[model samples]
Target: VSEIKTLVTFFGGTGDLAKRKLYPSVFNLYKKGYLQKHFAIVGTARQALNDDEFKQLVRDSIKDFTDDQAQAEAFIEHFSYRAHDVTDAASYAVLKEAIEEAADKFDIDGNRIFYMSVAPRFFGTIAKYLKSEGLLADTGYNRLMIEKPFGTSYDTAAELQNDLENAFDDNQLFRIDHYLGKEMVQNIAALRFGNPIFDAAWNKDYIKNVQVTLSEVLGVEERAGYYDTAGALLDMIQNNTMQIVGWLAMEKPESFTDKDIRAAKNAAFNALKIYDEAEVNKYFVRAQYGAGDSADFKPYLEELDVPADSKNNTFIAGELQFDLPRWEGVPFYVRSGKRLAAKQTRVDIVFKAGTFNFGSEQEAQEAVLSIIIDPKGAIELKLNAKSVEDAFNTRTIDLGWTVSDEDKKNTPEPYERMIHDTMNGDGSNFADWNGVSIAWKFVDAISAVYTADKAPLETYKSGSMGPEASDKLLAANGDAWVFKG
Candidate 1:
């Protein structure tokens, strides 16, 4: 870890993102001494609050989310809240001065990290104001940490890139997708890199297909307002699912540097088997949960804040192809939805045919590696095995590695791990601008079809896996979505 002293600034310091993730995560790093006394935080927002009041808010935020009371209080001491508007040029001067004062008081170098935890609309304005108001520090590192929903589509994402370039370089910007910080997800990279057998067989020659699923058991919740605008396709597929796809499908980098990882990801993105309008209709499946009564679950349409006539889809399943040699002809099946029977995010890699053979008339075996992300955090590999009888029968067997309760005690939240990485100049986990640009382009083709009502919105029971079309998407390829414990 670098001993570089730092000043962390949150652009939307009073919002949910700040309270729920920023402060608590910062405190965890502070308590762990990953960030020492040489670090300080400046919280910025349009809300007016004094130091004492803001301190109380920070204390309460941590109290609600974290169990470590003493550490929370200690971390809050390093946090100072400021009232400002990103659109107003004058506010940046005040912020700049405070940052300088905080840096000097904490005996830190002039390193400045601006975290944009606000909505996407303000992203460009803030980047402009930071430059216009001369907020860029002259003597040390200046990096911008930006959150997701970068843009609704490719054109807007390109616009965002144009806006950001006016003030910051791509090298200094950290585009975070929290899933990349996931322990098991990170372990995926380690497992592949460390194991020669698996690494050698990770391509189309040995792999049949790759399936990535992120499912939510609950309804839209309070985010119905945003959900209406961004259905499952925009909310999950563009950023979260695609990032995982890149990680899984990209070729091995020469080294694990930011540039090397990004180069690999960019290569994968460039090779994405892009779909035109006709192909989108053929492969993409969108589903709106109906108001039907399930045995235990409330239908998505019945959720509070949901419009009765809302055509918004809560489920999306699609097939992505790649032109790369490793993944060519191997379908990457991905699905995500709300109001499902389970809350889980996992990637299943199914090995190709002819890899496994049993005795006469025995079932063919497909090796599966699953990374579970939610409700349970674990990795399990499955293969067919015989039961304790000589009846010539076979059943799937599992080898599992899980993060038990004790492990959770020490494991940092996704946001915390990401924030720490940004502070330490570890950009290896962050996405590059090019990656976002390419993903949005691919998604925009689908979005145009869905938004225009050209793509049909099918219905599914709330607690079910997904629309029947989802299953058919795989079956058409002579395969099926692997469902297991």
Candidate 2:
């Protein structure tokens, strides 16, 4: 791969995200030679820090997370710092000068990547300031990376889109979704489309319900203020889980290009069947985590910054249907929550038993394919096989494989992949405006139902899989969660 020669500017460079994820990822790229001598990083924030102090801070951050102290110290040499007020126009001019100076010093050919690692409220303002103050490069490629929590709802997301449109075109803007950067998440398309065995039977005709579970073991520790408002619905389901659903349900594209892939994903998202207010409870279940088996455990309501009477859902399980012919009757069961049984992100493709016409109904029911994304990245195919001792009877067996330790070691972090893709002008892994709009629309429909008190929030133990209602949701359809903790 060719090296990237660009001056990367990070907004809110001194914040938690930059120190923990953004800088570490850049250091990885530097180690891999993707960012060599021709690249420079300019970190900007309101805090006053000289170049040496900022570089030391970055060095310490990388040291905290990385193993190689020597390489981290070398990586910090490419970095510089500039303290500026985000709202003031003159501050942007100063930022522009610093970026140009860094580009000249580092031999970067005017290429620029503006990474917004700050809050969402400043996204629009920073974009406008970048354009107004001529911080956008006149020559070489210029790209803008925006962070998540894009907006609260469809109306708000659309408004933010409009605000961003004024500064950067669709092609120039890269909306980041960290889930898309996961190695296994990217493999979903290849697992489905690259292999003929799975690809041929990926439709509703051969498959039963699809279940996607993204569970967490830890509660909202420090993000209670944000979690109380966003909840599991807006926090996880809307972006990451919904994106996974699109990848699972999308049709085969004409080609594997970004445009084709996004086209397929957009079609699937557009086909989402919007449930009515009265039918929300039938398709969706919401819950809050209460005290666990231990006496020290506190309920979600007791968490700091959480309102005592908050109706927000820390856990959400819902069934979604697509109107597309390929997946008309196939229910996409998705659930995500904080303080669950385990931290897992996986997809279970349950094949229709009768569709295969096996020897017996019981034998056919053993067909299942599991794609485990986290905790362990593996693929397990369960099938009925003849018993060694008996010719007439069959028994279920699993054929599974996981990524090798060597490959796992080489796998890049999500931020590393996302940052690399952004530099390479690959928006395929990023969320598109249309996808976000439609996801919000689907979320809004459910939100409206819950807001009207049509759906009641249940309570569950802190360490359990979720509310009992989640299990009943699938039990009603003669199915159950593939991964019950």
Candidate 3:
């Protein structure tokens, strides 16, 4: 509930990302008083819009996305514009002066939050310019909030990280993965650690397997150019899916503080069982979507800006194992894809079941705990129980709780939560370098195998779960996806 007093700067203020996400998020914060009268925003871009024109654009963005027009106008009042070339050092000096003027106008205490809402190519240039031009505040907190697609792989990501580290310390950087900002994603820790039942059974002995699936029904659409190169593995699994894995598998930390939580995640990632070429071939399945009869359907390669003969995978399903004693032999199956049957994100934890004397053999099926993140947020525990019609027969029963509609309406959007955390200097929801490094190492190994033609690049029908190989990957170990939709 802290109100930020920072002089915020948006590097690509006139861009699509700034208009679609950044302005709306800031407006929400303003509406909630997190960006009360003490805060001001400066938008920088190559577009030569005057202050009034830029403010109007921002107002339009808010008007399109938000219902509160009065508050949107009030929010726009705190905003100004600075046209600049990102590659030129002189332009940053102008931005610096603009920031100072805005800070003075808003009576802010010289705190700063520089948001890089532009392309990744400008990340290093902006950071270097911010330092060289002396835009970084010396009197108050200074933070850099970066958007994702951090890099395509380990080498490129390392280069980006090194460049960023040269300008700001690790603590000053907030690398955003919006999935971490989801209410249920944040609740994963509380659901596991705050409850005795889960904490007690969260090891290999009690749990059978863990499945994390992020599926999308839409094609690449406008992002086909980027998606063709990055694919599902780089776009989703390496960052978002891996972060979820860390949260789900990490050992309980001593406290819920950012430092403790990051330490636990670091350990989980470090313990990831690295796969050899043979294991990569055996455990991972990659696929491209084929055209279908549905109006919404288009083949992966047929998407605009995509190469016709592209081998890039729009879908990925893989099994990850951890070497730590608590997680040894437990498979963490992950799958993500575009053009799937539905848009959903969920985690399913299956628990081992022993003999029961009260019912038929069907009652022996394992119990399941599911955390459904979309379409809506809900948690359900399924257990085998005898039906009233037949005492000897068993059926599954569910004990579930869903986030209420009222609560959902009131909950902050992911970007709002992320921005709030960034302003308060909280890195709990942000990724640390170690976690990212480990994820890339594991993913790179798989990538190398595919690159060497050691693994199959299968094809799956549009509007299907994924390649049949994905199902067989689980079936080989006597497990299946808990939810197929």
Candidate 4:
């Protein structure tokens, strides 16, 4: 592959996220030769550090990850640093000078990528300054990558979008939703679109239901103030879980290009049912975890920094209905939580149960597709095989393969892939404006009911799958979660 020529500016160069993830993400691109002498990076923060100090910080960020000392230093040579304050307008002028300097030094013209690794409040401000300060290039592509939690709500997100639009177009703004880069959803597309059988049955007719589970089995104690308000609803479900659902429920695009995939996904998102209070009560389940069987698991309310009266939900499970033709009457059940039965990110597609053995519901067998994303990458297919017996009987045989260690070592990490994709101008793996806006709208409707405290807030034992309501949700549709805790 040819090396990419562009300038990347880090808004929060001194922030922990930049040191730990952002620099390493850029470093990985350099190591892979996508970034060479044609690219340069400018680190901007309030820290009073010279070029050498900033260079050391860059090298130190990927200290444990780098295999070669020489290549690492060569990558670091492309980095430049400048003191910056988001509030002060003059600070942007200083940043502009640094950006120009780095661009000239590396022979990179107008193609520039701005990374907002800073606090979200500064996101809009940085973008406006990037344009107002004349940092955005008119000759080449100018792009902006915003960090997660795009906005706490739809209104806030819209405001942020409006601000960013002043500087960059919708296509130029890459909302860096890392979950979109996960192996689970990418393989989800390949599984359905790349295969003939799965592609044909990937509809309400042949599929019984689709269940998406993103469970972090670990307990939380310290982030009460943040988690209390955000919870699994905002943190895990809206972005990670919903993005995956978009891929699952989208109409097959005419082509697998970035724009095609996004348009297809956006169509599904546009049809998402925005719930009212009554509908929310019927379809969604929100709960905080209580004590588990062991002493190691304490009630979420009892956790440090949590108020005894808090009704925050650590788990959220809901049924999403898309008004699209292929998805009509099909329930897309999604559940995300903390302190669940497992630490996994996966999808379970339950195909229509065969009526060949129609004697009992118990006798009915359904082919299932289990795609395990984390802990390992494996795609398992459970087929109903006829039993070799006098009685007509069937048994399930799982046929699947896993990612060997060698295969993993050759693939890029989520950040690396996403960053590289952004430079390549591929927005397929990133969330589009339509996708983000529609998601926030759907989530805001749910948030409204929760904020009113009118909807019942359920509770479940820690380390359990979820509240009883979650199971009952699918049970209402004659279905159950395919992956049990």
Among these predictions, the greatest TM-score belongs to 4
Q: Name model 3 segments beyond 4 Å from true.
A: 64-72, 291-298, 302-305, 356-359
**TM-score quality measure for candidate 4:** 0.97
Superposed Cα deviation of residue 38, candidate 1 (Å): 1.9
Estimate, for each residue in 148-264, the C-alpha lDDT of model 3 and write its tens digit. Answer: 878788998898888888678888889989788888988888878889989999999999999999999888889977787788989999998999898998988989889899998
Query: Which of candidates 1 and 3 reaches a greater TM-score?
Result: 3
Weakest 10 consecutive residues, lDDT, candidate 1?
Answer: 353-362
Residue 262 deviation, candidate 3, in Å? 0.7
Q: What's the lDDT for residue 422 in model 2?
A: 84
Question: Which lDDT value does model 4 have at 159?
Answer: 97
lDDT of 3 at 350: 90
Clashing pairs in 4: none
Error of 2 at 52 (Å): 2.3
* lDDT pick, better of 1 and 4: 4
Give lDDT tens digits, candidate 1, residues 275-332: 7878888999999886546445667677778888888879999999989888889999
TM-scores, each model vs. reference = 0.93, 0.94, 0.95, 0.97
lDDT of 3: 0.88
Q: List pairs with backbone clashes in candidate 1.
A: none
Evaluated against the true structure, the overall lDDT of model 2 is 0.87
lDDT tens string, model 2, 1-485? 68788889999999999988899888889888898789999999999999999998898888866677677777899999999998898878888889989988888886789999888998988888888789988888889999987999999888888888887887778878877778888888888888999899999888888999999998888898788878899999999999888889888999988889889998898898888887788989999999987765689888888879899999999999899999978888999998898999999988877444445434546378898898878989888776665445566789999999998999998889888888888888888888888999999999988777788899999889999999999988777888887
lDDT of the structure predicted as candidate 1: 0.83
CA displacement after TM-score superposition, residue 424 of candidate 4 (Å): 0.6
CA lDDT, every model vs. true structure: 0.83, 0.87, 0.88, 0.87
